[PDB]
Amino acid sequence: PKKPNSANRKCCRVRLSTGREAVCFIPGEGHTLQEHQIVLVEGGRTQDLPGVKLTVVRGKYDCGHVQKK
Amino acid sequence: CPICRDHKLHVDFRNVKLLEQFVCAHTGIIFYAPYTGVCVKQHKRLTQAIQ
Amino acid sequence: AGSRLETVGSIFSRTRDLVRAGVLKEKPLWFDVYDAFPPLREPVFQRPRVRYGKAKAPIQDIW
Amino acid sequence: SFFTKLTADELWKGALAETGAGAKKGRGKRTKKKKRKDLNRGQIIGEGRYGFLWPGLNVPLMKNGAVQTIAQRSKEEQEKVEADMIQQREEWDRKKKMKVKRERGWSGNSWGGISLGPPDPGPCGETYEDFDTRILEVRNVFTMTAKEGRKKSIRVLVAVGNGKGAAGFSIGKATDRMDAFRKAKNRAVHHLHYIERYEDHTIFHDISLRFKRTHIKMKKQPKGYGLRCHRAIITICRLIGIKDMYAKVSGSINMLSLTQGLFRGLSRQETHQQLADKKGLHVVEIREECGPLPIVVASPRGPLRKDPEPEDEVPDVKLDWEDVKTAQGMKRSVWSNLKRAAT
Amino acid sequence: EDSTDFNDKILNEPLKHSDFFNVKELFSVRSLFDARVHLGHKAGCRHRFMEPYIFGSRLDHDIIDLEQTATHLQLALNFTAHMAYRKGIILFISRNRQFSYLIENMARDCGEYAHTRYFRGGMLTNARLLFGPTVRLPDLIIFLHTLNNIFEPHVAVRDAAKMNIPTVGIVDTNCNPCLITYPVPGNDDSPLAVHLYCRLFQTAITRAKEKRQQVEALYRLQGQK
Amino acid sequence: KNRAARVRVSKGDKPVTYEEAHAPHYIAHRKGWLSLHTGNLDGEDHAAERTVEDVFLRKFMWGTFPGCLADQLVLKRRGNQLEICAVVLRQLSPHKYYFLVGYSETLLSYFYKCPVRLHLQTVPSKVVYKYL
RNA sequence: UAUACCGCCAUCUUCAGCAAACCCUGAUGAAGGCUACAAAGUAAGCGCAAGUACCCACGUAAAGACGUUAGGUCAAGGUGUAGCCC
RNA sequence: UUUAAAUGGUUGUUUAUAAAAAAAUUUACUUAAA
Ligand SMILES: [K+]
Ligand SMILES: [K+]
Ligand SMILES: [K+]
Ligand SMILES: [Mg+2]
Ligand SMILES: [Mg+2]
Ligand SMILES: [Mg+2]
Ligand SMILES: [Mg+2]
Ligand SMILES: [Mg+2]
Ligand SMILES: [Mg+2]
Ligand SMILES: [Mg+2]
Ligand SMILES: [Mg+2]
Ligand SMILES: [Mg+2]
Ligand SMILES: [Mg+2]
Ligand SMILES: [Mg+2]
Ligand SMILES: [Mg+2]
């Protein structure tokens, strides 16, 4: 992230159904996403990461719900 | 809400003094529910009793 | 109490209204005299402005 | 060692750490800020763990007209005394844990619209129990000093009024918030306005005024309309005693300009009597709810003019576009005329 | 039962007469003219608020209208007498150092108070801290000179209005009369003028105090029998 | 800045006694000594044992009369006698004072093997010299 | 863990300022408040000063506020928090 | 008017109320009897 924060935020690059390729933040603690997997993305910018304006939806297609604690 | 917090306040067409509190004395219009805070259920009962 | 807002109204209007409102319990010693024998002008604060343009003082030269 | 034990005052001063570098310049902020407990509170002189009963100290000196001798409470009796002592502590501790319900102002954590109570009585047996005080703004202003750097001060705006026309406001400044409240509250009662209320519920006419960059447009309203104005104006109106009014604040929403502008406009309103006297004509009120009945609200105390006021065919008056635009049904707003709680 | 009668016969009675103390006889327009009361400052020193009181400018020297002076002085002397009759504390204020000794004597002679010295900040608005919690402030303040020694309004004029104390003031052509309750337009420089003001206000106060004693005595003698 | 035994200025609301208001450089100028014995005179012995005894006695009396002492003790030694002069408050009942005087005089006489007297002087409240 | 603190201190200080409580000014903004032939300041308290010690009223000691450097010291002793307990 | 004199890592330096209460001891010998 940009100042004054510090972290390693888990992002992915997806090819959207429109054909454009964009970087999408994966929310939650722990993700099992691999290349060639299908995800549903939504809006909402990650205020830390400049230029990340998409978010992966947890619990749709391959991206599963975060595992309890 | 004001009506549901006191179980002794009965919304009845005969309890005219209670019903009067929920009507404008100067214009005669029944206050809409947000005005007094009564829930929709009690506002509907109050309106019917006033009529 | 009393009102120290000397630029709002006059000492009379302020005293009259506060006694009227019940803030001042007793009228001041001078109030009844002012009411009976008021001044020609009510002493209200005014701001002196300079004259611009064609505004001139009406004072005439004594000849 | 018995010789290394300190007193309670020394032990608490060290443990609390109220004076230190951590508190000088907003350096350390801890929610877990430790609180002092007086450990001598519930202790009785002569009461110990062994449970001895000392005649004349722990227990009465004489019983049945005879001097008591040294005795010791039985094991089970001491257990009860010790258990009761634990219960008493828990109860006392419970009292401190309880939170008293504070009436919130405009917001949960906001100071605006909280009552400060009546102004303090004057030195000469003077009282202001009729007046009520309400905070309008609390600001943390700062200046820079050579020795300490940022010096934090509190600026507080409070209004006071008895609800019967007499209302005022003042600013109070102090390092402590309590001192700022007191100074503002006590100074406001010495700077009171008198507001002319029409029928003791509204203003005599519509007032449009600009104080610096703040614009206030107030409209006279009938009974039952309520206060449909800026939350700060609502607070001031309740202190003045105005029950029905509408006001729109435009331009800068500075609280000091708004308050000073409101009192400037309300103080400079012309009553119906003042109008009749100035014009030498009857002031006749026409009410729609009373049909064509002419209600004379004021008559000229002096002589009544016999010439009718000249009726200008077209009035050369400055109209506010916002008013005209609303009358023509051209003003759509999803935020106007929204249902709100009784004010 | 007796208080209301006492107040009516004593406190309310004088307020029903136009000139109870007969102050009109103390001065005439001729006497004011002979004291040079009409001589104002040069036109370049004129205050805008004094224009209604100026008769004209004679070779760039403002002439004060003594016909208005007479009406204004009548009201000022009447108000002063009624306050002295009511046992009000009268304070004379002046910063003209040519007349400080005269004014301080005049106050002592009529049993009143004078403040001719440097006016310290808060004398009136912070009196309870300066003098004491039970100090009584003046009921009337008479300004023989309304300007301080830098030709600006004496601070007490503003502070008197803050404390709701009525003020009488001699206002020359360079003075600001807006906050003076009973302004009296006149020359405040010439000794003859200042000597007349002092004689007039000292007489009105002395006359009123004696009248209060006479009226009270008659009420008491009659009360017994 | 020096710290030793200096009650520092507050907001003018902290009541201090006469002893607590005077810093250590006044101990022979404006205030006297809280203990008078011969140990510290030139050529005199047993200054150390007198010091330990004084420290114990001040602790003993603080805990034996909890919340009663209104100022510091004045310890006096004349020959074999030890005299403790304490300014106490008027809150504890007189019966409890008499019990504690009889108890402390006896217990301390057996502990330090000398006749000990306790002279109590009661005050309605703490004597305030100034508000710092 | 002195970056939780008491205690005892260094430093500016070979300084003279800190300041409660009021009052007034700036259109009732952060803030500001003196002129002696005086124009809004009054000011408790603290420090300086004065007193006291040493051989004087000199000098030297002592004293030296509020704050500044999260300055020094958990190893004088005490102690908050966390940790160890074959 | 009048020599020269560059530099100083990142983030951290400001808001919600205050405080216990208790309880009494209960006025004047010696003695004895059945
Ligand atoms: K961060
Ligand atoms: K520790
Ligand atoms: K950071
Ligand atoms: Mg988001
Ligand atoms: Mg909340
Ligand atoms: Mg002049
Ligand atoms: Mg040193
Ligand atoms: Mg440190
Ligand atoms: Mg010396
Ligand atoms: Mg030294
Ligand atoms: Mg010194
Ligand atoms: Mg450090
Ligand atoms: Mg270190
Ligand atoms: Mg470089
Ligand atoms: Mg840098």
Curated annotation (Swiss-Prot), chain B:
Location in the cell: Mitochondrion
Source organism superkingdom: Eukaryota
Quaternary context: Component of the mitochondrial small ribosomal subunit (mt-SSU). Mature mammalian 55S mitochondrial ribosomes consist of a small (28S) and a large (39S) subunit. The 28S small subunit contains a 12S ribosomal RNA (12S mt-rRNA) and 30 different proteins. The 39S large subunit contains a 16S rRNA (16S mt-rRNA), a copy of mitochondrial valine transfer RNA (mt-tRNA(Val)), which plays an integral structural role, and 52 different proteins. mS40 has a zinc binding site.
More about this protein: There are 3 mitochondrial isoforms of bS18 in mammalia, localizing to 3 distinct sites in the mitoribosome. bS18m (bs18c) binds to the same site as bacterial bS18, mS40 (bS18b, this protein) binds to a novel location of the 28S small subunit, and mL66 (bS18a) binds to the 39S large subunit.
Family to which the UniProt record says this protein belongs: Belongs to the bacterial ribosomal protein bS18 family. Mitochondrion-specific ribosomal protein mS40 subfamily.
Protein name as annotated: Small ribosomal subunit protein mS40
Source organism (scientific name): Homo sapiens
Gene: MRPS18B
From Swiss-Prot, chain D:
Superkingdom per UniProt: Eukaryota
Cellular-component GO terms for this entry: mitochondrial inner membrane; mitochondrial small ribosomal subunit; mitochondrion
GO biological process: mitochondrial translation; translation
Keyword Ribonucleoprotein annotated: yes
Entry keywords, A to Z: Mitochondrion, Ribonucleoprotein, Ribosomal protein
Sequence ranges assigned to domain S5 DRBM in this UniProt record: 131-195
Quaternary data: Component of the mitochondrial small ribosomal subunit (mt-SSU). Mature mammalian 55S mitochondrial ribosomes consist of a small (28S) and a large (39S) subunit. The 28S small subunit contains a 12S ribosomal RNA (12S mt-rRNA) and 30 different proteins. The 39S large subunit contains a 16S rRNA (16S mt-rRNA), a copy of mitochondrial valine transfer RNA (mt-tRNA(Val)), which plays an integral structural role, and 52 different proteins.
Family stated for the protein in its record: Belongs to the universal ribosomal protein uS5 family.
Name used for this protein in its record: Small ribosomal subunit protein uS5m
Species the sequence originates in: Homo sapiens
Gene: MRPS5
UniProtKB/Swiss-Prot annotation, chain E:
Gene Ontology biological-process entries: mitochondrial ribosome assembly; mitochondrial translation
GO cellular component terms attached to this protein's record: mitochondrial inner membrane; mitochondrial matrix; mitochondrial small ribosomal subunit; mitochondrion
Segments forming a coiled coil: none
Lineage of producing organism: Eukaryota, Metazoa, Chordata, Craniata, Vertebrata
Protein name: Small ribosomal subunit protein uS2m
Disease: Combined oxidative phosphorylation deficiency 36: An autosomal recessive, multisystem disease resulting from deficiencies of mitochondrial respiratory enzyme complexes and mitochondrial dysfunction. Clinical manifestations include sensorineural hearing impairment, mild developmental delay, hypoglycemia, and intellectual disability.
Assigned keywords, A-Z: Disease variant, Mitochondrion, Primary mitochondrial disease, Ribonucleoprotein, Ribosomal protein
Family recorded in the similarity comment: Belongs to the universal ribosomal protein uS2 family.
Role description: Required for mitoribosome formation and stability, and mitochondrial translation.
Main location as per UniProt: mitochondrion
Residues of the full protein shown: 53 to 277 of 296
Domain of life: Eukaryota
GO molecular function terms listed in the Swiss-Prot or TrEMBL record: structural constituent of ribosome
Gene name of the encoded protein: MRPS2
Subcellular location: Mitochondrion
Swiss-Prot record, chain F:
Full-sequence range covered: 36 to 167 of 167
Protein name: Small ribosomal subunit protein uS3m
UniProt keyword annotation of Mitochondrion present: yes
GO biological process, one term: mitochondrial translation
Family the UniProt entry places it in: Belongs to the universal ribosomal protein uS3 family.
UniProt source species: Homo sapiens (Human)
Keywords: Mitochondrion, Ribonucleoprotein, Ribosomal protein, Transit peptide
Subcellular location: Mitochondrion
Cellular component annotations (GO), alphabetically ordered: mitochondrial inner membrane; mitochondrial small ribosomal subunit; mitochondrion
Keyword Mitochondrion: yes
Subunit structure: Component of the mitochondrial small ribosomal subunit (mt-SSU). Mature mammalian 55S mitochondrial ribosomes consist of a small (28S) and a large (39S) subunit. The 28S small subunit contains a 12S ribosomal RNA (12S mt-rRNA) and 30 different proteins. The 39S large subunit contains a 16S rRNA (16S mt-rRNA), a copy of mitochondrial valine transfer RNA (mt-tRNA(Val)), which plays an integral structural role, and 52 different proteins.
Main location: mitochondrion
Gene Ontology terms for molecular function: RNA binding; structural constituent of ribosome
